[PDB]
Amino acid sequence: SHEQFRAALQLVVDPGDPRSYLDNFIKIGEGSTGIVCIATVRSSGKLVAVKKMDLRKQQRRELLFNEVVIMRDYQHENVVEMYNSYLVGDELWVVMEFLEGGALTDIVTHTRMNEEQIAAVCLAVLQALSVLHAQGVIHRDIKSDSILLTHDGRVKLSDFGFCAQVSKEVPRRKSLVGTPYWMAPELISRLPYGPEVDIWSLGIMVIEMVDGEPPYFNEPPLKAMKMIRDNLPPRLKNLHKVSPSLKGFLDRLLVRDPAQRATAAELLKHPFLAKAGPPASIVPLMRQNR
């Protein structure tokens, strides 16, 4: 049955073994579904990233097909580019763009972002989401760990292993999927849900960028989920430090009723995003610069 799943994934990935062209694998990261390495392309010396996911270590194996559907169908300027996929022994390897700036997590846990920088992140993220949600794709795991940066401060959404599609025949999803602290209240309540859940998770990421941590982060997962399910929307620890503009923005995201929550398309017009700086404005936040 492992062997049965290996055969199925083989029909879907590219033929071959990229070790035939990559050198010097160095692990740089751990994800929910596997690990991430830098590799050197031997013909040219360029760097790529390689995501390795052990078919035996998955919560749900069939979610590994997510990486193939996104790669094949849903590329965009603010989405990490995937080049090729391979089955190597017991692992799916995806060779992808290397985002040398690392994850937004390393930033929010170590410095303070100003509002120009927060607005730049939110705009980049909302551009990816407007396009994905127009095609019925819901990411379902928006949080700082899923946002990667280039060396020159461009922002890209990554980590689509848990995404799902909605459509006229399947207008909503029912799976309990996400990282507890960032999960939308309707998703925790087990109400069927749609793209609106990424909007709520993005609002929690805005709290990450202001406070450094999502709400209830010191509470065990389950307890945090109960409180998200049952309490009023969570508040910034530092409400006093955010502009009225940023506050009114967040109030469009952390709306408990999914019907009243802003859509990505609507949030691209919010006046808070007018503060968005260029990618250069993100650069000084990165570990090699701060």
């Binding site: 749900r60 795991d141 760990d145 999927v177």
Partner: peptide, 9 residues
Amino acid sequence: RRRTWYFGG
């Protein structure tokens, strides 16, 4: 904890 969960369906 920052780990993603999957349990529904």
